[PDB]
Amino acid sequence: WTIPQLEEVLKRQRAQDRLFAGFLLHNIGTSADVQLFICVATGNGERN
Amino acid sequence: LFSDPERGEESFFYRQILLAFEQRDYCNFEVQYEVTHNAIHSWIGGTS
Amino acid sequence: SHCEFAGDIFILGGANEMPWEFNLPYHFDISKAVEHLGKKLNGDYV
Numbered sequence: 282w283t284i285p286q287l288e289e290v291l292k293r294q295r296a297q298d299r300l301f302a303g304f305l306l307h308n309i310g311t312s313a314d315v316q317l318f319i320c321v322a323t324g325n326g327e328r329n
Numbered sequence: 330l331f332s333d334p335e336r337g338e339e340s341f342f343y344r345q346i347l348l349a350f351e352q353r354d355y356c357n358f359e360v361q362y363e364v365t366h367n368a369i370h371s372w373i374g375g376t377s
Numbered sequence: 378s379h380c381e382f383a384g385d386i387f388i389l390g391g392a393n394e395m396p397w398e399f400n401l402p403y404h405f406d407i408s409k410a411v412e413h414l415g416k417k418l419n420g421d422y423v
Binding site for chain 1: 334335336337
Binding site: 323 | 378379
């Protein structure tokens with residue numbers, strides 16, 4: 282891809298709707314990784 | 330006609346004209362030739 | 378995670394009370410609660 286098609290594909294991927302999650306990173310003293318786990322409500326409400 | 334962001338320096342029909350020039354036999358030259366004329370007809374014609 | 382309420386127990390304690398320790402485990406009925414959960418009595422649960 283070059284600049285024209287890149288910019289219009291960026292525009293067309295901005296056009297629709299999407300959801301983000303926001304983190305506030307800070308130094309922790311060692312490199313690591315973090316996993317994202319969403320939880321769906323149940324009948325009892327417990328995070329099954 | 331003026332707004333083809335497919336690439337920043339090459340037109341829509343340039344690829345077609347080089348492809349039509351590539352082959353050697355005259356029948357296939359014609360069969361690669363007519364499409365540029367037809368596409369310009371469709372483009373500049375409008376829906377009138 | 379199907380969990381349901383089982384029952385109640387009351388313990389009496391006071392500021393000036395002799396330290397009391399039972400000499401035998403105490404038994405409570407929870408068969409109805411397990412039946413409500415639907416698992417068999419000799420099955421499994423927590």
